[PDB]
Write a protein that binds this ligand. Structure first.
Ligand SMILES: C=C[C@@H]1C[C@]1(NC(=O)[C@@H]1C[C@@H]2CN1C(=O)[C@H](C(C)(C)C)NC(=O)O[C@@H]1C[C@H]1CCCCCc1nc3ccc(OC)cc3nc1O2)C(=O)NS(=O)(=O)C1CC1
Ligand SMILES: [Zn+2]
Length: 201
């Protein structure tokens, strides 16, 4: 302890994006490691934000955050209770729910939001932090199966990323991979209706 020397955790910092605006998905880095560490400390990020899916970092982890209905959502297991860096300084979470593994901040100016799905469709697509678009069959409210299994390395750092309907509506937020002996066959996600409930409380 000793209060005079106690440290503060830094802000979550946007360090890039998954670009989905064209015919090709690809990852873009907007901030390297030294700038990220500085921005984490001040909570002041003057970078212009664009797009729906951000790549975010703390001091110890890198993962995704997805804008839906003007809220930038990610996983509690990545972000904890942290603020996010913004042009005006650190921004406090608007939503925090450890039970859902969910947090949200006001979507950054410049971001674009995905629309919540209304199709009731079960043919889905998971966007990874490396900008891979993996097909996923919905198997329950919060479960989908990967049409082609991958090692868990392949999904590491994609928590907070979106599951999309063929149209491109947001169906959910990737939470955790279900694996056996290191191979991911299934995914757990936070369905968008759970977000929408949270957005009414
Ligand atoms: C491989 C990619 C994968 C998506 C990733 N998710 C995880 O690694 C989660 C985090 C943690 C364990 N995870 C797992 O995926 C494990 C693992 C063996 C690692 C594959 N699998 C697993 O549990 O399967 C069991 C069926 C589910 C039942 C148990 C699910 C419990 C979910 C969960 N809830 C809470 C609530 C509150 C918390 O407070 C701190 C913490 C939590 N942590 C949790 O799970 C990811 O990319 N992360 S990340 O981006 O690298 C990182 C920066 C954030
Ligand atoms: Zn839809």
């Amino acid at each position: 302890s000793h209060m005079a020397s106690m440290k503060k955790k830094g802000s979550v910092v946007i360090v890039g994006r998954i670009n989905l605006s064209g015919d090709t998905a690809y990852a873009q880095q907007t901030r390297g490691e030294e700038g990220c560490q500085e921005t984490s400390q001040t909570g002041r990020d003057k970078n212009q934000v664009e797009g729906e899916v951000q790549i975010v970092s703390t001091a110890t982890q890198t993962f995704l955050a997805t804008s839906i209905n003007g809220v930038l959502w990610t996983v509690y297991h990545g972000a904890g209770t942290r603020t996010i860096a913004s042009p005006k300084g650190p921004v406090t979470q608007m939503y925090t729910n450890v039970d859902k593994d969910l947090v949200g901040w006001q979507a950054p100016q410049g971001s674009r939001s995905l629309t919540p799905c209304t199709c009731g469709s079960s043919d889905l697509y998971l966007v990874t932090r490396h900008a891979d678009v993996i097909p996923v069959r919905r198997r329950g409210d919060s479960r989908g199966s990967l049409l082609s299994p991958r090692p868990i390395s392949y999904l590491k750092g994609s928590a907070g990323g979106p599951l999309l309907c063929p149209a491109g509506h947001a169906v959910g937020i990737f939470r955790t991979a279900v694996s056996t002996r290191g191979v991911a066959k299934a995914v757990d996600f936070i369905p968008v209706e759970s977000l929408e409930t949270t957005m009414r409380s």
